[PDB]
Design a protein around this ligand. Structure first.
Ligand SMILES: C[C@H](CCC(=O)NCCC[N+](C)(C)CCCS(=O)(=O)[O-])[C@H]1CC[C@H]2[C@@H]3[C@H](O)C[C@@H]4C[C@H](O)CC[C@]4(C)[C@H]3C[C@H](O)[C@]12C
Ligand SMILES: C[C@H](CCC(=O)NCCC[N+](C)(C)CCCS(=O)(=O)[O-])[C@H]1CC[C@H]2[C@@H]3[C@H](O)C[C@@H]4C[C@H](O)CC[C@]4(C)[C@H]3C[C@H](O)[C@]12C
Ligand SMILES: C[C@H](CCC(=O)NCCC[N+](C)(C)CCCS(=O)(=O)[O-])[C@H]1CC[C@H]2[C@@H]3[C@H](O)C[C@@H]4C[C@H](O)CC[C@]4(C)[C@H]3C[C@H](O)[C@]12C
Ligand SMILES: C[C@H](CCC(=O)NCCC[N+](C)(C)CCCS(=O)(=O)[O-])[C@H]1CC[C@H]2[C@@H]3[C@H](O)C[C@@H]4C[C@H](O)CC[C@]4(C)[C@H]3C[C@H](O)[C@]12C
Ligand SMILES: C[C@H](CCC(=O)NCCC[N+](C)(C)CCCS(=O)(=O)[O-])[C@H]1CC[C@H]2[C@@H]3[C@H](O)C[C@@H]4C[C@H](O)CC[C@]4(C)[C@H]3C[C@H](O)[C@]12C
Ligand SMILES: Nc1ncnc2c1ncn2[C@@H]1O[C@H](CSCC[C@H](N)C(=O)O)[C@@H](O)[C@H]1O
Ligand SMILES: O=C(O)[C@@H]1CS[C@H](C(=O)O)N1
Ligand code: SF4
Ligand SMILES: [Cl-]
Ligand SMILES: [S]
Length: 347
């Protein structure tokens, strides 16, 4: 079908593989703009004008895994490794709550040191502050996930990365798509609000792969979906590969919103890294969440999944104020509660 016809099918929610492929393959400006408007309007209708702030503390860059894309991979010897103490992490969380954060995200490499009990202790302390806690710690045994839920954790982010099992295993040689999915299913069973999502523009990833990523997200009806471009890192095997395209990645965000109209979708830091102002554009094309960097110096600059990240030269407390200004200049509002998913049951 033509652009106008694909848009009509999207508006009528005829989400066939062919409609999603054609939406991702058409490069016409008018079509893309209309797709972006559609996603923006669906966002406003379902999740409103509140942009939810998730303050992220990247508390350790130690990792046991060796993912080919990631600057924290275990084989990268050209990176100073760091670990925040549990006291530092709690007090840094308390500062974010003082600054108005209503969710604290704890993210790390897969660092065995904390697992599971030091994380449980931290979570319990942060939960006393009356905020949501989200974990993004990678793949762990069911048992660990269960202990963290009992400790009070509310949400868990585990991007599925790529729904192509062959590409997944090549890029993540310690593990598999099956394992990743099983972790995601376990987290949902345990009562977490669960986040998935993928990178766009991975080496070897095709448009058909991106369609499969959308259908996977739609299948499992995730609470949150984190999408960004692949950004090559010079101390990795994928150093010389092409970066993911911003517009294609933005279309993935827009389609995610159309497919999952009541979901929580961030404007990721990676989007703001590859294009100046990329988060702001993404917030106008389907996204409704922002995750300001709350990692303190001198560690912030050592948490380099990809290079050139924005927010590295700012002061320790700048990023929450910075996103509150962004939200205002976008004519949006800050989140009034924890920003949990508010499901709209349909037919
Ligand atoms: C309307 C005014 C004045 C002529 C012109 C001057 C510079 C133009 C923007 C830039 O070209 C960057 C970008 C290119 C895309 O292609 C279309 C979108 C965008 C934002 C453009 C929109 C518009 O066209 C602008 C504001
Ligand atoms: C700001 C620019 C330039 C527009 C422009 O230059 N016009 C503004 C003022 C001109 N006036 C209206 C005052 C009168 C025109 C008389 S004049 O004499 O200037 O031609 C317009 C041009 C194309 C617009 C984007 C696309 O839609 C896609 C998408 C839709 C979403 O939903 C919201 C996000 C997004 C990215 C849009 C944002 C923004 O909105 C853009 C960049
Ligand atoms: C942390 C310190 C010291 C006092 C303190 O420890 N304050 C705890 C407040 C706890 N809460 C945020 C939950 C209050 C909600 C009140 S509210 O009426 O907003 O619901 C206080 C003193 C002045 C406060 C800033 C200014 O105000 C301007 C601005 C208002 C925004 O809005 C949030 C961001 C920002 C930058 C504020 C952040 C933080 O807060 C500051 C630095
Ligand atoms: C100006 C920069 C490139 C900067 C650079 O690196 N030089 C390029 C890179 C990505 C481009 C946007 C995306 O295409 C999405 C969207 C399509 C709409 O049609 C028009 C508006 C909008 C926001 C585009 C505007 C502009 O064109 C951008 C920011
Ligand atoms: C302190 C820094 C400078 C400024 C820049 C933008 C400001 C925020 C926005 O204005 C939106 C909003 C309006 C409400 O009135 C009060 C709350 C809030 C979150 C503002 C707080 C504070 O004032 C900010 C962070
Ligand atoms: N080079 C790169 N470009 C863009 N995103 C990257 C990247 N390297 C890693 N990421 C993204 O960063 C996310 C957080 S990684 C930290 C969390 C945890 N270890 C985990 O793997 O889940 C990953 O899910 C991945 O999608
Ligand atoms: O873009 C980034 O740098 C981060 C990586 S994970 C987080 C998300 O939850 O989407 N975004
Ligand atoms: S993506 Fe997560 S698990 Fe993979 S190397 Fe990076 S930090 Fe470790
Ligand atoms: Cl969250
Ligand atoms: S920041």
């Amino acid at each position: 079908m033509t652009g106008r016809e694909i848009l009509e099918k999207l508006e009528r929610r005829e989400f066939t593989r062919e409609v999603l492929k054609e939406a991702l393959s058409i490069n016409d400006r008018g079509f893309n703009e209309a797709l972006f408007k559609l996603a923006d309007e669906i966002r406003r209708k379902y999740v409103g004008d509140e942009v939810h702030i998730r303050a992220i503390i990247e508390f350790s860059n130690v990792c046991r895994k060796n993912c080919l894309y990631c600057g924290l991979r275990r084989d990268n010897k050209n990176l100073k490794r760091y670990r925040m103490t549990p006291e530092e992490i709690v007090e840094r969380a308390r500062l974010a709550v003082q600054f108005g954060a209503k969710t604290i995200v704890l993210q790390s490499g897969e660092d065995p040191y904390y697992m599971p009990d030091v994380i449980s202790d931290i979570v319990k302390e942060i939960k006393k502050m009356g905020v949501a806690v989200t974990l993004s710690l990678g793949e762990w045994p069911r048992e660990y996930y269960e202990k963290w839920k009992e400790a009070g954790a509310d949400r868990y982010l585990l991007r599925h990365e790529t729904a192509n099992p062959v590409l997944h295993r090549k890029l993540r040689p310690d593990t598999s798509f099956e394992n990743r999915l099983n972790c995601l299913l376990t987290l949902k069973e345990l009562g977490y609000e669960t986040g998935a999502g993928s990178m766009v523009g991975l080496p070897g990833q095709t448009i058909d792969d991106l369609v499969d990523d959308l259908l996977f997200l739609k299948e499992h009806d995730f609470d949150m979906v984190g999408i960004g471009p692949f950004i090559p890192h010079p101390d990795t095997p994928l150093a010389n590969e092409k970066k993911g395209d911003f517009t294609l990645t933005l279309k993935m965000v827009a389609l995610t919103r159309i497919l999952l109209p009541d979901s929580n979708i961030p404007a990721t830091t990676a989007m703001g890294t590859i294009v100046p102002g990329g988060r702001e554009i993404t917030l106008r094309c389907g996204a409704n969440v922002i995750m300001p960097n709350w990692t303190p110096s001198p560690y912030r600059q050592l948490y380099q999944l990809y290079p050139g990240k924005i927010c590295v030269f700012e002061k320790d407390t700048a990023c929450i104020p910075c996103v509150m200004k962004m939200i205002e200049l976008l004519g949006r509002k800050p989140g009034r509660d924890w920003g949990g998913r508010k499901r709209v049951f349909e037919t």
